[PDB]
Amino acid sequence: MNVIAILNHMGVYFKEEPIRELHRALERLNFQIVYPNDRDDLLKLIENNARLCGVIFDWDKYNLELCEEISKMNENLPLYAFANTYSTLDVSLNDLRLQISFFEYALGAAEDIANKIKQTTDEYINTILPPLTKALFKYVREGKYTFCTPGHMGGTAFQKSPVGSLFYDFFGPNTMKSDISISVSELGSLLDHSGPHKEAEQYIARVFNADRSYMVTNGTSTANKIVGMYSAPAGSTILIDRNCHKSLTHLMMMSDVTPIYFRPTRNAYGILGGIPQSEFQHATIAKRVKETPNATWPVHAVITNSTYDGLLYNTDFIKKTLDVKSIHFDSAWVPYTNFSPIYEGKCGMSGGRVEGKVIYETQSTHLLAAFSQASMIHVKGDVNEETFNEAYMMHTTTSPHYGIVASTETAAAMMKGNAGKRLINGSIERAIKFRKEIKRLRTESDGWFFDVWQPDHIDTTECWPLRSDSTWHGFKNIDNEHMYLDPIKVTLLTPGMEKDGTMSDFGIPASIVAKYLDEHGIVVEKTGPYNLLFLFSIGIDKTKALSLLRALTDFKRAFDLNLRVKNMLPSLYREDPEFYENMRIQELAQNIHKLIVHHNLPDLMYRAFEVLPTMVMTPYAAFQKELHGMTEEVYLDEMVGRINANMILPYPPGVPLVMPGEMITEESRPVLEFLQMLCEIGAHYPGFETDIHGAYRQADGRYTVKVLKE
Amino acid sequence: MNVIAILNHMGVYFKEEPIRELHRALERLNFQIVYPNDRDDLLKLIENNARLCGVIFDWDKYNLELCEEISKMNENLPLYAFANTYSTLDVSLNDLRLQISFFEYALGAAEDIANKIKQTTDEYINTILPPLTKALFKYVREGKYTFCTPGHMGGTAFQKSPVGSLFYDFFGPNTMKSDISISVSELGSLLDHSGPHKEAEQYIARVFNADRSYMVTNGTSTANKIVGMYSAPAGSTILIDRNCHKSLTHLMMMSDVTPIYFRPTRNAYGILGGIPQSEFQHATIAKRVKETPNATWPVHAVITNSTYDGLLYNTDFIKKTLDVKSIHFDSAWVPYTNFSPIYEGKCGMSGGRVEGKVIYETQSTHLLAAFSQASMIHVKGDVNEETFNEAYMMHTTTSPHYGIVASTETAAAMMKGNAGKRLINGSIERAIKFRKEIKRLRTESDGWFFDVWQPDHIDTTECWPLRSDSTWHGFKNIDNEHMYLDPIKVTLLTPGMEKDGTMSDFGIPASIVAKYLDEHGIVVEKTGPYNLLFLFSIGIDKTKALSLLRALTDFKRAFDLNLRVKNMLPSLYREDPEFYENMRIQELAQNIHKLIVHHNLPDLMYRAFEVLPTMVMTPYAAFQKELHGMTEEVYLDEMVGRINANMILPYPPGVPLVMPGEMITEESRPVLEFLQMLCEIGAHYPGFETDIHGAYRQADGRYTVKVLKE
Amino acid sequence: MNVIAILNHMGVYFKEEPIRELHRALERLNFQIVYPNDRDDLLKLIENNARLCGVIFDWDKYNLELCEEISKMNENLPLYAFANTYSTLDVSLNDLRLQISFFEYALGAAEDIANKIKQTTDEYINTILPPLTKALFKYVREGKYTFCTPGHMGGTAFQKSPVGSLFYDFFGPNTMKS
């Protein structure tokens, strides 16, 4: 932070010479002076460079031309205004709130003015930096504790070791010294929620519109279990989205609870739809309580809001309708709802308390930018603070990393205020630009191209509603004014399926487009049989957009030339030279596509997940048997009529198929048929193997599963 | 890594000029040349500087004088030997294993020789560096994934933000880029234990003498729960050291188990003694099974080996004697046992398997040097790998930090081989030196001084045995050839108690010595009423030893002058100027000491922990009530006859006093008397407050505790 | 292969200063910068000089005036395009097949951008060179076979002989080692 811009020649020595003296005095005080070519260049420098930290200018020549323009960009930026004859305090200025220091052009003033500017900059720096990190830097500068642990002693031991020097040499002293313990007692305490730790909680709780906010450093995996174990008593029944995370299965195995499942809808594509309004209404729930063996009224519900594909609930309706005392919105996908008005009435925290209920959001901070494992628990309502805090303290890491904690606090510091508001606004604007760019290239090229899966026109900047009277989304009998498409989540479609969900004769499975992009280091966020997703973050610049956009036109060009796999996919070639020697990219695509077409994969996959295996015992009940080691393996073929010991998690489509305690019967035979079909279709091409978790491929090529012993 | 030493003038141009040409050629290839004044300076440079990475010398002038000396220090260090007339392959060399490249002094050779040396150094570097970190650096150099998350995009977002720049500016690009996800698929997988992750496990498992080793990144807190939940079935009885960690209480509350406690011995000082041999013998355990309500034969035992004060068990005796199928040595204090022969027969992993039993060590790597939260599970025996691995995967962080994992791997890299063996040997040697230094200063000074708590003579370098025929240790009727003192753990004694455990008229409580050292930034590892501990690590150098040694003589000097608290403890003074205005350091000491003497604190503390509160219900049973919110607060005075809801953990002495479900009665009245006494003695001086966890100081100054409702 | 052409003054510090920083950063990375007097001089340089291996330009000032003209001469030639306000992905570009990397004018970017350009140039070089000659050069750089024949040992014997040095001195190590 040392670049000072100067903008001018004035035509008079009495002005020019003091600025020369000040230039020189400031350079001696370790400032880099930069000189925008013109007024517009200066505004672009500021706009793009946060390291520009002051502007010197002639008051008369520039004040009415600059002051408001700069204040729009950054209201703390130091301005050093030099006066002429007519320079003064005009009544027009009286009403503006500006951060202004007035200075004259004089030789020999730089020493004192520089010292004041230094002090005033430190004052501004001190205001904007968060206090815990500020104190940490001060310790690293001043403190003198020797004869101390950690044994590495500020990384010292790493430097005398070539092997340790590799790790130290990269990270360096500061990184090594920031790994501190409670021996630095003046930073307060996380466990007492005291000092700069309280200041952080209030800052966050106020920013994110929560009653109370906890900082969790082991992800939403851990936030779920802290909320779960406090929330789900033994012997109780819970309503749980059949679309649930594994960490909630691990909770069920550890707690004696009976699940009744909210039942999402699904369309032919396999895209999950929302739990319909009926699922929340007292009459519907009461009926399932009647139909579920040993069920009682639910004590805790967990809803995933939004769905992945951007269907958000009318949360005003849910909070009013769902008659459950404890409602936990796992809102991992929507951490940003407080920051766009388009999400009002469509998020957990929106509005005020819900009388008679505690509402949770658990959020995976790491659709924002933060270190992996950073998660928040946002509580809207009361807990038993002593029992909740004991629950928190029992599940706290053994050695908390002092950076991870600061990384989550500094992630907010970055996104804070205007400039973070303007950053996200910019990304929304470019999202819509890119959307229209795909349409352009679709026009310009002869023959097949990518398309976008979206409404016919997007004349409106919002999360576009999905309506029952529209066909573009492919869902059947959708609720209206219920689901909305987030502009920044861009799905692309590859050739292979019809707008119906029926199959084309010509197809290019998306997995092949991924292999190509993988040779070129470009990662596809998410891929399905014929779909690819791209996220337009604040990362994504003009260089990356051009490289991606160009890479996509290069795929088409290379595909259409029918390049040899040998030439287009050299790393794949090296896996089996003979297998791949003569194959061309279009033949690889044809063969895999023909398999998909023939094996009717989408229909079989759809049907496997539309019925439920039979719950013979609960996951917890089966785990009691496992706890005593009462498990054997059987072959996959032999599994009908047996009680499964493990979750069986196949890829595709990546969601649980059989739970511990469930059994395939005749009612649920399509389950087994899908599984056997996956083993067959995936046995053909090296690099395109079957993948089913919970099934064990024996060295002989047969699959086993774990079952309960009799 | 670029410093090359040259050692010589030879008196002939045909030798000197090529070395000039090579000096210049090497400087142009970015080597720093250094010139030891003499042969001894070179050996000291090598000994102290790992960045010296090559030595050029005249073969004849130096080979018989240098080769073996350097090979003793570092057997990979590149040597570049220049030949004369008599230089050749003498039969005497045939048997030595050396890393030698032979070169001639010639102009113009540096370009090619430098390139070979560069390549040969990279080959050596590549051998010594561990492969996962090596691959990570290569990615950071070569890879080109754009349009990607993490959103911060290699820290890019931090740089445009003064607040984020504070965090980035300190850590920098490399630190920011090493926070990666499984998108970098070529590093293998932790969860599959595959690729460079397997290579790490084998490396560690072989180094630490285990059958199998797991890498845990959430401390031994988490290692305990992974082993616990696999090991302790519901309805079973467990033998557990009444000296247990809180994380094992949190396990008991979560699992339906019945505890029977191994009962340590204790002496008047309050120092824990070992569970006697009788506690392991079948007849003793059988008798407690009879006497314990609803007890069955134990399925799992947890012993803390060693004790803190260095009493190690004959583990050969325990493994042979203790008739329990599952024995878990929580060996957090003894991570280094594999590396000194003095610990043979005295650690969990020593020797081979124990037929018919699984033996665990859980170790807190962070008495070594590693990041906080680093812990290992070392298994000696078989587990059900699928159920154990499912247990591991359920308790794995949400977002693993990729550095923490490398920090534990690089901590081993540092300590590896000879140089890490010589480092620890050096620390043992200095420990004994310092021990004799305290004795010297004790002689030189008139009047009182510090003493060391150790045997009368230490003519032997080992862990000295504590014997029943010796009085120095203060324990009553100790087992012989049972406990040993680790030389590197140095306890110092302050005036105040007699060698009996009886009280002196003159005392200086250790807490006051801590306040002094705290003003000077010096931390005391561990303090008790009249004791202070110092660890002589590989960190501790001559500068730190002198500063500590001098700081200790300065305390005496300043104490004996009776400086004003105002002058000697200015920060304490600022807390209450009026309170402290006229008080001198000796008066502060007197008043606090007189309190200790009068309140007979050691006797009362000793007695509070020698009886056990009555277990009315188990901690788990009480938690069922808490699970339903059935808790109220009562005042401390009102607690006899009530069932405690929380653990009550007082400081001092820092170990549990009452468990959930326990009740103070008449049998255990000294418990309440100690607690009330602590509230009284600690109410006198600002900065010397009472501290009891589980008791809540109300704003009015009264204490409450949580109890079960009736 | 190290001559990079720069074609411009733009009249604004926010553009000119990053290009100054990049000029200097690139010169430190061992590039020779050349400056065509004008657009036509640049096209003649390219047309006549295969050692010109990259062009840096302002996207708006020059893209519609240069892109097609350069693509007619050499379709692998690295272009480093710097963006302004109106710079973006216009539907008109969607159909052209071009080798384009997009970059911004920024101080301190040269170290990373230079490394990417170096890598991208090596990728282009590696595509165009035939693989046997490529492998031969790699051996001459890395391999370490000593105690070997040919007896001349990479021409070594020629250098100690004035008569043999006449033949070696002219051809040199590379010719002798191939």
Residue numbers in the entry:
A (entry chain A), B (entry chain A): 1 to 366, 368 to 711
C (entry chain A): 1 to 178
Give passages from the manuscript.
extracellular pH, and works in conjunction with a cognate inner membrane antiporter. excreted by the antiporter in exchange for a new amino acid substrate. that it is a decamer made of two pentameric rings. central pore, with the CTDs at the periphery.
(cryoEM) and combined it with the crystal structures of the individual proteins. and the C-terminal β-sheet of LdcI23.
